[PDB]
Design a protein around this ligand. Structure first.
Ligand SMILES: CCCCCCCCCCCCCCCCCC(=O)O[C@@H](COC(=O)CCCCCCCCCCCCCCC)COP(=O)(O)OC[C@H](O)CO
Ligand SMILES: CCCCCCCCCCCCCCCCCC(=O)O[C@@H](COC(=O)CCCCCCCCCCCCCCC)COP(=O)(O)OC[C@H](O)CO
Ligand SMILES: CCCCCCCCCCCCCCCCCCCC(=O)O[C@H](COC(=O)CCCCCCCCCCCCCC)COP(=O)(O)OCCN
Ligand SMILES: CCCCCCCCCCCCCCCCCCCC(=O)O[C@H](COC(=O)CCCCCCCCCCCCCC)COP(=O)(O)OCCN
Ligand code: NA
Ligand code: NA
Ligand code: NA
Ligand code: NA
Lengths: 615, 615
């Protein structure tokens, strides 16, 4: 079907541009003309729903949804074939039920959209089935290649025939499906939730994506007890994306993509080198400072690691640094980005826990500074011990010229931090302002931007957001089961004798997260673990801002821990060195991170005092 | 199918607003910032193509396409049933072939769109089939109502079955249609065009719409001689709408609709009454002046007749004027609008004849003033003869206040005329400027416009333009047949002994048009007659600007001529009087119009000298 080969990309880019313009107009009108608008937010959320659905469809087409690949890599090809067939079957079922629930909920929408002219909510609720059909088509398309390469046992015609038969049964004899209700045959009772979770773990491990396994577990739970209750909970699937705080993700991603161009990074690194280059430790300090500077704009670590390593490692190697130490420094300095705001992890945690993003950012600011100072101290100690030389002192004129060149680029982090801390802007408004400023600077003051490049960047940002959107909707759906069955209360009742001692609970949770982070990627681990943990945290009367900061730091420590750390692989690839050297170099730099984690775990006041002062 | 019940309206309104904004930006940038844009025109035309197709679809759904209804009104109901079935059959066939040719031409599009980034022309050519499917669905929908009320013999299931069978044949064995080629059975030869024209007339009279009958005639001609040649000509169907001069129609219509509000007309009429009300003839002069003022903004006569009669007739009746005279004045004064620019008829003539719209607009101004002066003279003569009284002289303060009130509204005609005459703007730019100014005035100075009202007005303007678009495309298609066979040359060769005497040819053409205008509406008559007349005019070396002006005046005279004059019916309805009295009152006022037509026919220098001076 060649004439619909770019529908999602083009339509999503158009919607993205429209939303960007709408929010820009809102901010400009409110701040300058003192003329607040009452429809901009509603329209932006309405469009964002469709943007998210389109991103999900693109990800489904390209087979990019996140999944756990630890046990998969240990399987033979023959064994992998069966499991890869099974996961396609499950995803087919998931998309079918997706379409069904979308149609039903669209038919059920009644209330109007006040503050937008009284329009009906059907406009919001219609995005689900319309894009679900396209997702089904994309899945069928991908099955052709899957079977062609020999990775699955099922062709596309099988799925087409099954879809036709299922639609016929649905539209002409739905009462037949009442034989797929597990409650007919066995009454499990209270153990239904435990069985559902047990099968959830297995299907997740065999290779099914997290976003689909979270849906399958809830469907099994409802089928096990009483099916007709699913209709009440199915509205959350759509209501989750209609959120204003969640809207800041794509714009932060776009800002990072725009600022990650080669020209800007060169200026920033040149300034940092001219500044910090002449001290004992030298290029290590330069690398840490550059990472800290880029943290204020980037919302992720791997982007920083893969954007600057080629440049930094050259300087450190040339100065006289060993390969293992330089790899370790490059890998370790990357975790600053997710901690210093803005940060995608904090946004996800706030959305899941219904906490305010601004307080999370303010609370998490300090740990970034502590980690940076500790890293500088350790780098100084190592460089002094190993007897490296000192680079020449830079003269003033080079500092002046480097600062003059980098001025506009380095101004952005101050913009964002001032906008958020002072309360002038909300996080979404701050993201919009940063994106607009970056676009202006790229187009005019550096000439590196063009309209086609901007459109491609918007498409890329939407594609990235699509992966997160599915997990968000499904985790919101799964939280319904978790809360209804009161799993947290039962777990707390089981874990007696540790109450009144929250320190032991924190230690246990930290140990569990540290152990799990060795084999599972951070992004999947967050969604896997948070829904079960947040209610248990609320059970013991643990502050949620501090809990969010602690969990985010503990998960970011994961990308450094063998076997499976993305930072290690990226650094080894970029610097052209064996992963063993990178690992041995990182080992000496893990002590500061562990010490910081211990300090914040035992002294919550450190985290919790700044946000109260500011808010 | 409830959830697609407003698709055309909403999408077309959105596209209309987008085009309006694009042209506004182009004009503002070029005139103020001296920064010409090279993509605005291409984008506007590309969007206008889709707007026109959507309008055609809406008109097809509502059954509003123009047709000749003279012979139809004389038929019994039982005899009307057969013909009404036949016309549905023919329209079904026409839409089917429309879809087929759209698909073929979209597949055949190769060249790119320079000045728009090199995009492919498939974007332009894709509008045809996509909307043709929707037109087919709307036709099938309307057939249900048609059969329900007993006006046709065929249900909708019949058409659905026929469409399915025809599509199956088209897609799986198209070589079967080669039995529908009339050239297999009889080789008519040179008489093919004559036979096609004869059947064209025959089917047109039984009530088939003009737009479909032209297409049917062309298809029959091609099938009669050699079918495969149709593919070369089918591109004009799409290329006709991709025209910049044609883009001025909807915006002039929108300007008229916006300015036809109750408040503005009240101010204009109050000013006119305060100005011209105290002279022998009085309210007649007032009515003529008000019509002249409204001509500069309105592009049609019936709109002026129906938007002002209720107010004018009251004043004339109260003054002491008889009913027949007041009806005659009201009916006669309406023909100023189509003559004084802007005018839709002149735009259509220029599009069909490839002449410049600006020259036609400048040339048609003088007759619009001669007619007004002659009408004033005749009204004075009648009022003096019948001994009506004189109204009191208005004092200065009322004149000052009426002016002060109407100032902004009455400014618009000067805006348009100055913009066009001075060469500052092209007609499309002038239309855009007038629409923007009217919107601004309605929203701010007079506080009468709202976004919903503007959207509804845009929808109405698109609906009106949809009717014209189909006739434009089909007449462009039919011109190919007319030019290929050289009908004009043969007609000229038949009509020997009149060459070297263009006066006799003009007299013959004028007599024919005057005779035809008695039974056929002006809008249908223009498309019916122009395609054959224009080549014959070119044959005799007759200037085309003068020919266009003369034909437009001759056709506008039609709406006054019984049996069938729309002006008479509208005036009788609005003034609540019998059509016989309206006719007998119009009779005395037809002498000035005939004298003006004779004068311009015998003295082309009256028309042809102003445009040469200005251009
Ligand atoms: C593990 C995944 C479990 C999937 C759900 C198992 C039972 C679902 C069917 C069921 O309980 O029956 C009802 C639910 O049936 C469905 O609609 C389910 C649709 C999908 C069924 C499963 C598809 C994949 C099968 C393999 C009745 O049908 P209905 O809802 O269409 O009834 C009429 C009306 O729509 C009211 O809802
Ligand atoms: C009466 C039923 C209405 C439909 C008539 C047929 C419409 C499609 C005809 C067509 O496409 O051409 C055919 C040829 O048919 C004829 O020669 C006659 C067609 C109609 C005859 C004249 C109709 C007059 C209408 C009044 C077959 O060749 P093709 O053009 O399909 O070639 C393959 C591919 O589709 C593109 O080429
Ligand atoms: C609507 C999207 C249409 C679509 O799939 O876009 C392309 C259609 O080509 C076109 O340019 C067709 C435009 C049709 C617009 C309606 C596919 O072609 P592609 O993505 O392989 O083309 C690569 C260069 N854009
Ligand atoms: C735009 C796509 C078509 C929308 C459409 O036809 O919906 C109409 C409104 O329904 C609706 O309420 C459509 C809601 C939005 C549908 C998805 C976009 C028809 O339905 P209607 O009979 O209510 O339309 C008239 C009275 N509003
Ligand atoms: Na960050
Ligand atoms: Na790890
Ligand atoms: Na006019
Ligand atoms: Na007439």
């Amino acid at each position: 079907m060649k004439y619909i080969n770019k529908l999602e990309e083009w339509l999503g880019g158009a919607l993205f541009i429209a939303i960007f313009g709408i929010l820009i107009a809102q901010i400009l009108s409110r701040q300058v003309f003192h003329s607040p608008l009452i429809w901009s937010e509603e329209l932006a959320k309405l469009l964002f729903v469709y943007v998210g659905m389109l991103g999900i469809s693109v990800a489904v087409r390209k087979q990019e949804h996140v999944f756990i690949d630890f046990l998969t890599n240990l399987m033979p090809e023959k064994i992998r074939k069966f499991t890869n067939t099974f996961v396609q079957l499950l995803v087919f079922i998931c998309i079918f039920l997706f379409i069904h629930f979308g149609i039903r909920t669209f038919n059920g929408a009644s209330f109007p959209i006040d503050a937008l002219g009284g329009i009906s909510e059907k406009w919001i609720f219609a995005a689900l089935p319309v894009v679900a059909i396209l997702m089904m088509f994309r899945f069928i398309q991908a099955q052709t290649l899957n079977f062609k390469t020999g990775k699955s046992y099922l062709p596309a015609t099988f799925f087409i025939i099954s879809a036709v038969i299922l639609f016929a049964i649905l539209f002409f004899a739905p009462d037949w499906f009442k034989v797929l209700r597990i409650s007919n045959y066995i009454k499990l009772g209270s153990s239904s939730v435990y069985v559902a979770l047990l099968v959830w773990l297995i299907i997740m491990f065999i290779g099914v994506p997290v976003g689909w396994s979270l849906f399958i577990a809830t469907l099994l739970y409802f089928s096990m007890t009483r099916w007709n209750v699913v209709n009440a909970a199915t509205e959350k699937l759509v209501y989750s994306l209609d959120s204003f705080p969640l809207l800041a993700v794509p714009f932060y991603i776009l800002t990072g993509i725009l600022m990650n161009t080669g020209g800007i990074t060169e200026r920033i690194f040149n300034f940092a080198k001219a500044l910090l280059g002449h001290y004992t430790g030298g290029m290590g300090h330069v690398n840490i400072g550059a990472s800290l500077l880029f943290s204020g704009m980037s919302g992720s670590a791997l982007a920083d690691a893969g954007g600057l390593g080629q440049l930094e490692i050259k300087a450190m190697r040339d100065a006289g640094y060993d390969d293992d130490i330089c790899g370790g420094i490059t890998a370790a300095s990357c975790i600053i980005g997710p901690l210093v705001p803005p940060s995608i992890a904090m946004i996800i945690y706030g959305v899941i826990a219904n906490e305010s993003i601004a307080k999370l950012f303010i609370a998490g600011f300090i740990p970034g500074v502590l980690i940076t100072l500790a890293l500088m101290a350790m780098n100084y100690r190592i460089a002094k011990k190993r007897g490296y030389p000192r680079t020449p002192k830079a003269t003033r004129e080079q500092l002046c010229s480097s600062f003059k060149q980098s001025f506009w680029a380095i101004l952005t982090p101050l913009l964002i931090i001032g906008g958020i801390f002072s309360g002038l802007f909300s996080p979404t408004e701050s993201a919009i302002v940063a994106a607009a400023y970056s676009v202006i600077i790229g187009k005019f003051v550096y000439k590196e931007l063009t309209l086609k490049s901007l459109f491609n960047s918007c498409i890329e940002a939407m594609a990235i957001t699509g992966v997160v959107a599915l997990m968000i909707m499904t985790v919101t759906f799964f939280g319904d089961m978790i809360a209804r069955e009161q799993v947290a209360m039962r777990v707390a009742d089981v874990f007696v004798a540790v109450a009144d001692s929250p320190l032991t609970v924190l230690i246990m949770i930290n140990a569990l997260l540290l152990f799990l982070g060795m084999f599972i990627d951070a992004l999947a681990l967050q969604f896997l673990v948070l829904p079960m943990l947040i209610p248990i945290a609320m059970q013991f009367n643990i502050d949620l801002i501090f809990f969010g900061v602690m969990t985010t730091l503990n998960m970011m420590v994961g990308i450094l821990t063998p076997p499976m750390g993305m930072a290690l692989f990226v650094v080894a690839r970029v610097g052209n060195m064996s992963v063993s050297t990178v690992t041995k170099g990182v080992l000496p730099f893990l002590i500061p991170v562990f010490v910081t984690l211990v300090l914040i775990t035992i002294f919550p006041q450190i985290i919790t005092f700044v946000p109260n002062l500011l808010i």
